[PDB]
């Protein structure tokens, strides 16, 4: 086509989606990770995670307001990944890399799994 | 912070949101523009438009499944802008620029209004 493109549009959209998350506006699901609860937008979760995409395209699960993750999932690892979904920034640290990678594999977040594997390979 | 960032994340999220729109997955509102109907995600509309942000943060309007736009709004102009919201690409043409700018002013999409004003100023 003969379209023009606004370079910052996708980033500005995500920044606004994160502002809605921070103010709990139009969040439509709670993700339960053991004793912790995380409110989010189903569409954003699906856009970032192969697991959430599969869950919310399921004709029965699409209507659930609460999703319980596997008990092996670490709440901090999930929190770091949820922040990444809404900001593009990943708080990857020596103390959390194993939990973050395990959570990203479960959530099916391929690019996160890739950088975790590379950061781990560098420290061995 | 000491975060790392994935450059393409925001673009990949928007591409996935557009895929959900194309398959009518988790769309939660219909925008009526005269005889035409457009299905969309309230969160994406709010993230792109000052008008939709104001509408869906209203304690009563937040719960509506149908929003009727002002009858002066052109359905093609709205369609072009809805595509822009989900892709960052604007199909701006001599034949549609006036309708697109009028629709972007109504929807409160400042960057679109800015490029329309510049493209119009160049042709005078």
């Amino acid at each position: 086509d003969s379209c023009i493109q606004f370079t910052r549009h996708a980033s500005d959209v995500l920044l606004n989606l994160n502002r809605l998350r921070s103010r709990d506006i139009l969040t439509d699901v709670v993700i339960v990770v053991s004793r912790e609860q995380f409110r989010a937008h189903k569409t954003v979760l699906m856009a970032c995670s192969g697991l959430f995409y599969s869950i919310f395209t399921d004709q029965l699960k699409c209507n659930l307001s609460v999703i319980n993750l596997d008990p092996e999932i670490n709440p901090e690892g999930f929190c770091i990944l949820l922040d990444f979904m809404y900001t593009s920034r990943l708080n990857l640290r020596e103390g959390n890399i194993m939990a973050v990678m395990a959570t990203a594999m479960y959530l099916q977040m391929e690019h996160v799994v890739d950088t975790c594997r590379k950061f781990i390979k560098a420290s061995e | 912070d000491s975060c790392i960032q994935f450059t393409r994340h925001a673009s990949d999220v928007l591409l996935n949101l557009n895929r959900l729109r194309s398959r009518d997955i988790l769309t939660d509102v219909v925008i009526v523009v005269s005889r035409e109907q457009f299905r969309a995600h309230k969160t994406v509309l709010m993230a792109c438009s000052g008008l939709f942000y104001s509408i869906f943060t209203d304690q009563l309007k937040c719960n509506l499944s149908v929003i009727n736009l002002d009858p002066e709004i052109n359905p093609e102009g709205f369609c072009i802008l809805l595509d822009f919201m989900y892709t960052s690409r604007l199909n701006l043409r001599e034949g549609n620029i006036m309708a697109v700018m009028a629709t972007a002013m109504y929807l409160q999409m400042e960057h679109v209004v800015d490029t329309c004003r510049k493209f119009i100023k160049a042709s005078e």
Binding site: C3, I4, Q5, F6, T7 | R89, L90, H111, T115
Partner: peptide, 4 residues
Amino acid sequence: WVIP
């Protein structure tokens, strides 16, 4: 704005 750019030519994509």
